[PDB]
Amino acid sequence: KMSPLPTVENQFTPSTSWSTSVGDGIGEFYSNLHPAFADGVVYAADRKGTVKALNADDGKEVWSVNLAEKDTPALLSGGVTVSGGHVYIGSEKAQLYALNTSDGTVAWQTRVAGEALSRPVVSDGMVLVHTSNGQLQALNETDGAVKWTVNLDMPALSLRGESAPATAYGAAIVGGDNGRVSAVLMQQGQMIWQQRISTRLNDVDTTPIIVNGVVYALAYNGNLTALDLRSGQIMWKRELGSVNDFIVDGNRIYLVDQNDRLLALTTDGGVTLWTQSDLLHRLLTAPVLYNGNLVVGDSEGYMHWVNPEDGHFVAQQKVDSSGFLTDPVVADGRLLIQAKDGTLYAITR
């Protein structure tokens, strides 16, 4: 019971610069596994354990490794995250891998507390993982040693959604599955503040987003909340039907709700600017802001290009029959997106 393709007059025709296979992708499994970009290179993976580095200009292979064969599928899940010469990927077997950007060799591999379903987050010489047993762990970037472990939320009853940390000025901010946002010091994991923002096939990204000393966070009840970074004080709350995913760019918020409605809000009190409801139940990706357009993929393999000022469609294109699920990312002036069968596209216009 999904909405038919809208009738769109395309203002331009998006162009594929390049596309490359990456094993067998995620198939029919839910995943948060998405591509990454750093210093002229794209990094991408599949669930079974293929990991590749590609030249961002032409898609040509720099290196390829198979983590299934390091000795059975690796079940790569959280990431990909790139920082400081390392490629970080979490797995459903509770492994965190750190690969060298130079050649794909394993610098280190750590058995973390639980399934690593959410992207690793790198700050202040440490890599943070929020694991599905409800713990937050900080590991040294140099050897993957566990520096500290903090108890945050409940061991998960859903395999859908994402809950990564967000870092600012020596603090990690974390949401999760129990309607709380927590702030902890990166040094030793000391609790700074904790705030209640709320009193399964749950598909909510509870990852906080920090912009200009404000924390923006989604909860299970369909609420979007703004908190003061230093204190955790609630600045405002917005009662939407039920939100799934969002981004913040300057003083604008772009969200997708559980029914695949697209909304734009102000950061000044969470007031709605516009709504676009013609993609209802088409199962959208998270939105990305790319060269003045808001872009989403859908389960049928289409990409939809939206004017961020008014929510009007500017382009619609069929790209991959296997469909889209995981986050699109901006890479070297191109839009990167990975299909469910693993195929990676680099698109302009």
CSV table of C-alpha atoms in Angstrom, one decimal:
chain,number,residue,atom,x,y,z
A,1,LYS,CA,0.0,0.0,0.0
A,2,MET,CA,2.6,2.6,-1.2
A,3,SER,CA,2.1,5.9,-3.2
A,4,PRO,CA,2.7,5.7,-7.0
A,5,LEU,CA,5.7,7.5,-8.6
A,6,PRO,CA,4.9,11.3,-8.7
A,7,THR,CA,4.7,13.0,-12.2
A,8,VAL,CA,7.9,15.3,-12.1
A,9,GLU,CA,9.2,17.7,-14.8
A,10,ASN,CA,13.0,17.1,-14.4
A,11,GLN,CA,14.9,20.5,-14.2
A,12,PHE,CA,18.1,18.5,-15.0
A,13,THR,CA,19.2,14.8,-15.7
A,14,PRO,CA,21.5,13.5,-13.0
A,15,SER,CA,24.6,11.7,-14.4
A,16,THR,CA,26.5,8.7,-13.0
A,17,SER,CA,30.2,9.6,-13.0
A,18,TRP,CA,31.1,6.0,-12.0
A,19,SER,CA,29.7,2.8,-10.3
A,20,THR,CA,31.4,-0.2,-8.8
A,21,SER,CA,30.3,-3.6,-7.2
A,22,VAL,CA,31.0,-4.2,-3.5
A,23,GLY,CA,30.4,-7.9,-2.9
A,24,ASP,CA,26.7,-8.8,-2.3
A,25,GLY,CA,25.7,-5.7,-0.2
A,26,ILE,CA,23.2,-6.3,2.7
A,27,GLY,CA,20.6,-8.4,0.7
A,28,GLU,CA,17.2,-8.5,2.6
A,29,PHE,CA,18.7,-7.7,6.0
A,30,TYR,CA,18.3,-4.4,7.8
A,31,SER,CA,21.6,-2.5,8.1
A,32,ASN,CA,23.1,0.9,8.9
A,33,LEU,CA,26.3,0.0,6.8
A,34,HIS,CA,27.1,3.0,4.4
A,35,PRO,CA,30.0,4.4,2.4
A,36,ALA,CA,32.6,6.9,3.6
A,37,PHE,CA,34.9,9.5,2.0
A,38,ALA,CA,38.3,11.0,3.1
A,39,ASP,CA,41.1,12.8,1.2
A,40,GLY,CA,40.2,11.8,-2.4
A,41,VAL,CA,39.2,8.1,-1.5
A,42,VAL,CA,35.8,6.3,-1.1
A,43,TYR,CA,35.6,3.4,1.4
A,44,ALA,CA,32.7,0.9,1.2
A,45,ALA,CA,31.8,-2.7,2.5
A,46,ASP,CA,29.2,-5.5,2.4
A,47,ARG,CA,27.7,-7.6,5.2
A,48,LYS,CA,29.7,-10.7,4.3
A,49,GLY,CA,33.1,-8.9,4.8
A,50,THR,CA,34.3,-7.4,1.5
A,51,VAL,CA,35.9,-3.9,2.1
A,52,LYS,CA,37.2,-1.7,-0.7
A,53,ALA,CA,39.0,1.7,-1.2
A,54,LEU,CA,38.3,3.5,-4.5
A,55,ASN,CA,39.7,6.6,-6.2
A,56,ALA,CA,36.9,9.2,-5.6
A,57,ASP,CA,37.3,10.6,-9.2
A,58,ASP,CA,36.9,7.3,-11.2
A,59,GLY,CA,35.8,4.4,-8.9
A,60,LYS,CA,39.0,2.5,-9.7
A,61,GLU,CA,40.3,0.1,-6.9
A,62,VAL,CA,43.2,1.2,-4.6
A,63,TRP,CA,42.8,-2.0,-2.4
A,64,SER,CA,40.2,-4.8,-1.6
A,65,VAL,CA,40.2,-7.2,1.4
A,66,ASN,CA,37.8,-9.9,2.6
A,67,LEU,CA,37.3,-10.0,6.4
A,68,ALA,CA,35.3,-13.3,6.0
A,69,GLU,CA,38.8,-15.0,5.2
A,70,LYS,CA,41.0,-13.3,7.9
A,71,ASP,CA,41.5,-16.9,9.3
A,72,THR,CA,32.3,-17.6,7.5
A,73,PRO,CA,30.7,-14.1,7.0
A,74,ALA,CA,31.9,-11.2,9.2
A,75,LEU,CA,28.4,-9.6,9.5
A,76,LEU,CA,29.8,-6.0,9.0
A,77,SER,CA,27.1,-3.6,10.3
A,78,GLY,CA,28.1,-0.3,11.9
A,79,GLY,CA,30.1,2.3,9.8
A,80,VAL,CA,32.0,2.8,7.6
A,81,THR,CA,33.8,5.6,9.5
A,82,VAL,CA,37.2,7.1,8.4
A,83,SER,CA,39.6,9.2,10.6
A,84,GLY,CA,43.4,9.6,11.2
A,85,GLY,CA,44.6,6.9,8.6
A,86,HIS,CA,42.1,4.3,9.9
A,87,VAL,CA,38.9,2.7,8.4
A,88,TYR,CA,36.5,1.7,11.4
A,89,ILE,CA,33.8,-0.9,10.9
A,90,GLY,CA,31.6,-2.6,13.6
A,91,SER,CA,30.1,-6.2,13.3
A,92,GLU,CA,27.1,-8.2,14.6
A,93,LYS,CA,29.7,-10.6,16.1
A,94,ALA,CA,30.8,-7.7,18.5
A,95,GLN,CA,34.1,-7.0,16.6
A,96,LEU,CA,35.4,-3.5,15.9
A,97,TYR,CA,37.9,-3.5,13.0
A,98,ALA,CA,40.5,-0.7,12.4
A,99,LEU,CA,42.0,-1.0,8.8
A,100,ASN,CA,44.9,1.1,7.5
A,101,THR,CA,43.7,3.6,4.8
A,102,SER,CA,47.1,3.0,2.9
A,103,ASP,CA,46.5,-0.8,2.1
A,104,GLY,CA,43.5,-2.3,4.0
A,105,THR,CA,45.7,-4.2,6.4
A,106,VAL,CA,44.2,-4.8,9.9
A,107,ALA,CA,45.9,-2.4,12.3
A,108,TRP,CA,43.9,-3.9,15.2
A,109,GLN,CA,40.6,-5.7,16.0
A,110,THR,CA,38.8,-5.5,19.4
A,111,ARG,CA,36.0,-7.7,20.9
A,112,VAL,CA,33.7,-4.8,22.0
A,113,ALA,CA,30.9,-5.3,24.6
A,114,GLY,CA,28.1,-6.2,22.1
A,115,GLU,CA,26.8,-6.0,18.5
A,116,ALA,CA,28.2,-2.8,16.9
A,117,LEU,CA,25.2,-1.8,14.8
A,118,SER,CA,25.9,2.0,14.9
A,119,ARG,CA,28.7,4.0,13.2
A,120,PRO,CA,31.9,4.4,15.2
A,121,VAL,CA,32.6,8.1,16.2
A,122,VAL,CA,36.2,9.4,16.5
A,123,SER,CA,37.3,12.3,18.8
A,124,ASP,CA,40.3,13.3,21.1
A,125,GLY,CA,42.4,10.2,20.2
A,126,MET,CA,39.6,7.7,20.9
A,127,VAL,CA,36.9,5.7,18.9
A,128,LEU,CA,33.5,5.4,20.6
A,129,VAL,CA,30.9,2.6,20.0
A,130,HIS,CA,27.4,2.4,21.4
A,131,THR,CA,26.7,-1.4,21.5
A,132,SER,CA,23.3,-3.2,21.4
A,133,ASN,CA,23.7,-4.4,25.1
A,134,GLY,CA,23.3,-0.7,26.0
A,135,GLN,CA,26.9,0.2,26.9
A,136,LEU,CA,29.2,3.0,25.5
A,137,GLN,CA,32.9,2.1,25.1
A,138,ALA,CA,35.9,4.3,24.3
A,139,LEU,CA,38.9,2.6,22.6
A,140,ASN,CA,42.4,4.0,21.9
A,141,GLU,CA,42.8,4.8,18.1
A,142,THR,CA,46.4,3.5,18.4
A,143,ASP,CA,45.8,-0.1,19.7
A,144,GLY,CA,42.0,-0.6,20.2
A,145,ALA,CA,42.4,-1.0,24.0
A,146,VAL,CA,39.2,-0.4,26.0
A,147,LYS,CA,39.8,2.8,28.0
A,148,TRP,CA,36.3,2.9,29.7
A,149,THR,CA,32.8,1.3,29.6
A,150,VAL,CA,29.6,3.3,30.7
A,151,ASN,CA,26.1,1.8,31.2
A,152,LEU,CA,23.6,4.0,29.2
A,153,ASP,CA,20.3,2.3,28.0
A,154,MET,CA,18.7,-1.2,27.9
A,155,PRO,CA,19.8,-4.2,25.9
A,156,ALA,CA,17.9,-3.7,22.6
A,157,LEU,CA,14.5,-5.4,21.7
A,158,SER,CA,14.7,-4.0,18.1
A,159,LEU,CA,17.3,-4.7,15.3
A,160,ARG,CA,16.1,-1.6,13.3
A,161,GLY,CA,17.2,2.1,13.9
A,162,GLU,CA,20.7,3.5,14.8
A,163,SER,CA,22.1,5.2,18.0
A,164,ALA,CA,25.6,6.5,17.5
A,165,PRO,CA,27.3,9.1,19.9
A,166,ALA,CA,27.9,12.8,18.9
A,167,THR,CA,31.0,14.6,20.2
A,168,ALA,CA,31.7,18.3,21.1
A,169,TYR,CA,34.4,20.0,23.3
A,170,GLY,CA,35.6,16.8,25.2
A,171,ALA,CA,32.0,15.4,25.8
A,172,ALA,CA,30.1,12.5,24.1
A,173,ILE,CA,26.3,12.9,23.8
A,174,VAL,CA,24.3,9.7,23.4
A,175,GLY,CA,20.5,8.9,23.0
A,176,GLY,CA,19.1,5.4,23.0
A,177,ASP,CA,16.1,3.1,23.5
A,178,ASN,CA,14.8,4.5,27.0
A,179,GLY,CA,13.9,8.1,26.2
A,180,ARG,CA,17.0,9.7,27.8
A,181,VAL,CA,19.9,11.8,26.4
A,182,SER,CA,23.2,11.5,28.4
A,183,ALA,CA,26.5,13.7,28.3
A,184,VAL,CA,29.8,12.0,29.5
A,185,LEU,CA,33.4,13.4,29.7
A,186,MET,CA,35.7,11.7,27.1
A,187,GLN,CA,38.7,11.5,29.6
A,188,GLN,CA,37.3,8.8,31.9
A,189,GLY,CA,33.5,8.4,31.0
A,190,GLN,CA,32.3,10.6,34.0
A,191,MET,CA,28.5,11.5,33.7
A,192,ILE,CA,28.0,15.3,33.2
A,193,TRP,CA,24.2,15.5,32.8
A,194,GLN,CA,21.2,13.2,31.9
A,195,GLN,CA,17.8,14.4,30.6
A,196,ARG,CA,14.5,12.6,30.0
A,197,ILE,CA,13.0,13.6,26.6
A,198,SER,CA,10.1,11.0,26.7
A,199,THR,CA,7.9,9.4,29.5
A,200,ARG,CA,9.7,-4.0,18.1
A,201,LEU,CA,10.0,-2.6,14.4
A,202,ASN,CA,11.2,0.7,15.9
A,203,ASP,CA,13.2,2.4,13.1
A,204,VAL,CA,14.2,5.7,14.8
A,205,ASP,CA,17.8,7.1,14.5
A,206,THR,CA,18.4,8.3,18.1
A,207,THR,CA,21.9,9.6,17.2
A,208,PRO,CA,22.0,13.3,18.6
A,209,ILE,CA,23.1,16.1,16.2
A,210,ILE,CA,25.1,19.0,17.8
A,211,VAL,CA,25.0,22.5,16.0
A,212,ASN,CA,26.2,25.9,17.6
A,213,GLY,CA,25.9,24.7,21.3
A,214,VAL,CA,22.4,23.0,20.8
A,215,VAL,CA,21.7,19.2,20.9
A,216,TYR,CA,18.8,18.0,18.6
A,217,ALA,CA,17.5,14.5,19.4
A,218,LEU,CA,14.6,12.1,18.3
A,219,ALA,CA,12.7,9.8,20.7
A,220,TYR,CA,10.4,6.7,20.4
A,221,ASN,CA,7.2,8.8,21.1
A,222,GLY,CA,7.5,10.8,17.8
A,223,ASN,CA,9.1,13.9,19.5
A,224,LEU,CA,12.0,16.1,18.3
A,225,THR,CA,13.7,17.9,21.2
A,226,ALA,CA,16.4,20.7,21.5
A,227,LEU,CA,18.7,20.7,24.6
A,228,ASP,CA,21.4,23.2,25.8
A,229,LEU,CA,24.8,21.4,25.2
A,230,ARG,CA,26.4,22.7,28.4
A,231,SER,CA,23.5,21.8,30.9
A,232,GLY,CA,21.1,19.4,29.1
A,233,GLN,CA,18.2,21.9,29.8
A,234,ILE,CA,15.2,21.4,27.3
A,235,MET,CA,15.0,24.6,25.1
A,236,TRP,CA,11.9,23.3,23.0
A,237,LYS,CA,10.0,20.1,22.1
A,238,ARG,CA,7.9,19.4,18.9
A,239,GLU,CA,5.1,16.7,18.9
A,240,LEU,CA,5.3,15.1,15.4
A,241,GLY,CA,3.4,11.9,14.5
A,242,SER,CA,6.5,9.7,14.7
A,243,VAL,CA,10.0,10.7,13.2
A,244,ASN,CA,12.5,8.1,11.7
A,245,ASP,CA,15.5,10.2,10.6
A,246,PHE,CA,16.8,13.8,10.2
A,247,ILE,CA,19.7,16.2,9.4
A,248,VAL,CA,20.6,19.8,10.7
A,249,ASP,CA,22.2,22.4,8.3
A,250,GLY,CA,22.7,25.9,9.8
A,251,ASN,CA,19.3,27.0,11.0
A,252,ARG,CA,17.2,24.3,9.1
A,253,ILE,CA,16.1,20.8,10.1
A,254,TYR,CA,15.1,18.2,7.3
A,255,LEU,CA,13.3,15.1,8.6
A,256,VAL,CA,11.6,11.9,7.3
A,257,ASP,CA,8.7,10.5,9.5
A,258,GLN,CA,7.6,6.8,9.9
A,259,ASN,CA,5.2,7.2,6.9
A,260,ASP,CA,7.9,8.8,4.6
A,261,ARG,CA,6.6,12.4,4.8
A,262,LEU,CA,9.4,14.9,4.3
A,263,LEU,CA,9.4,18.1,6.5
A,264,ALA,CA,11.5,21.3,6.8
A,265,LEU,CA,11.6,23.1,10.3
A,266,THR,CA,13.4,26.1,11.7
A,267,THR,CA,16.0,25.6,14.5
A,268,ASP,CA,14.2,28.6,16.1
A,269,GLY,CA,11.5,26.6,18.0
A,270,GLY,CA,11.0,23.7,15.6
A,271,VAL,CA,8.3,25.5,13.5
A,272,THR,CA,7.4,23.8,10.2
A,273,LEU,CA,8.3,25.6,6.9
A,274,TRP,CA,6.9,22.9,4.5
A,275,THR,CA,5.7,19.3,4.1
A,276,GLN,CA,5.9,16.9,1.1
A,277,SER,CA,3.8,13.7,1.4
A,278,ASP,CA,3.7,12.3,-2.2
A,279,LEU,CA,6.3,9.5,-1.3
A,280,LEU,CA,4.1,8.0,1.4
A,281,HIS,CA,5.1,4.4,2.4
A,282,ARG,CA,7.8,4.2,-0.4
A,283,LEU,CA,10.4,3.5,2.5
A,284,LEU,CA,12.9,6.4,2.1
A,285,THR,CA,16.6,6.6,3.1
A,286,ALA,CA,17.9,9.4,5.4
A,287,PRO,CA,18.0,12.8,3.5
A,288,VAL,CA,21.4,14.4,2.4
A,289,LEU,CA,21.9,18.1,1.4
A,290,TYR,CA,23.9,18.0,-1.9
A,291,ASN,CA,24.7,21.2,-3.9
A,292,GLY,CA,21.5,23.0,-2.9
A,293,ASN,CA,19.2,19.9,-3.3
A,294,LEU,CA,17.7,17.6,-0.6
A,295,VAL,CA,18.1,13.9,-1.9
A,296,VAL,CA,16.5,10.6,-0.7
A,297,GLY,CA,16.5,7.0,-2.2
A,298,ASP,CA,13.5,4.6,-1.9
A,299,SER,CA,13.0,0.8,-1.6
A,300,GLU,CA,12.0,0.6,-5.4
A,301,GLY,CA,15.5,2.0,-6.4
A,302,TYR,CA,14.5,5.6,-7.3
A,303,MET,CA,16.3,8.8,-6.2
A,304,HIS,CA,14.1,12.0,-5.5
A,305,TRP,CA,15.7,15.5,-5.7
A,306,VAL,CA,13.9,18.2,-3.6
A,307,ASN,CA,14.1,22.0,-3.5
A,308,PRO,CA,15.0,22.7,0.2
A,309,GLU,CA,13.1,26.1,0.1
A,310,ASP,CA,9.6,24.7,-0.7
A,311,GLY,CA,9.7,20.8,-0.8
A,312,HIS,CA,9.0,20.7,-4.6
A,313,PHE,CA,10.5,17.9,-6.7
A,314,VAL,CA,13.3,19.1,-9.2
A,315,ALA,CA,14.3,15.6,-10.5
A,316,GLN,CA,13.3,11.9,-10.3
A,317,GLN,CA,15.5,9.0,-11.6
A,318,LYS,CA,15.5,5.1,-11.5
A,319,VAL,CA,19.1,4.0,-10.4
A,320,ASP,CA,19.2,0.4,-9.0
A,321,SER,CA,16.4,-2.3,-9.1
A,322,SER,CA,17.6,-3.8,-5.7
A,323,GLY,CA,16.5,-0.6,-3.9
A,324,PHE,CA,18.1,1.9,-1.4
A,325,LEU,CA,18.1,1.8,2.5
A,326,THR,CA,21.4,3.1,3.9
A,327,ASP,CA,22.6,6.8,4.1
A,328,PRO,CA,23.7,8.6,1.0
A,329,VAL,CA,26.9,10.7,1.5
A,330,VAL,CA,28.6,13.7,-0.2
A,331,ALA,CA,32.1,12.8,-1.6
A,332,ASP,CA,34.4,15.2,-3.6
A,333,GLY,CA,31.6,17.2,-5.1
A,334,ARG,CA,29.6,14.0,-6.0
A,335,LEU,CA,26.6,12.2,-4.3
A,336,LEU,CA,27.6,8.6,-3.2
A,337,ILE,CA,24.8,6.0,-2.6
A,338,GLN,CA,24.9,2.2,-2.1
A,339,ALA,CA,22.1,-0.2,-3.3
A,340,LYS,CA,20.9,-3.2,-1.1
A,341,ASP,CA,22.8,-5.5,-3.5
A,342,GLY,CA,26.1,-3.5,-2.7
A,343,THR,CA,26.4,-1.5,-6.0
A,344,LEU,CA,28.0,2.0,-5.3
A,345,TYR,CA,27.0,5.0,-7.5
A,346,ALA,CA,28.8,8.4,-7.7
A,347,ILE,CA,26.3,10.9,-9.2
A,348,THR,CA,26.4,14.7,-10.2
A,349,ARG,CA,23.9,17.5,-11.1
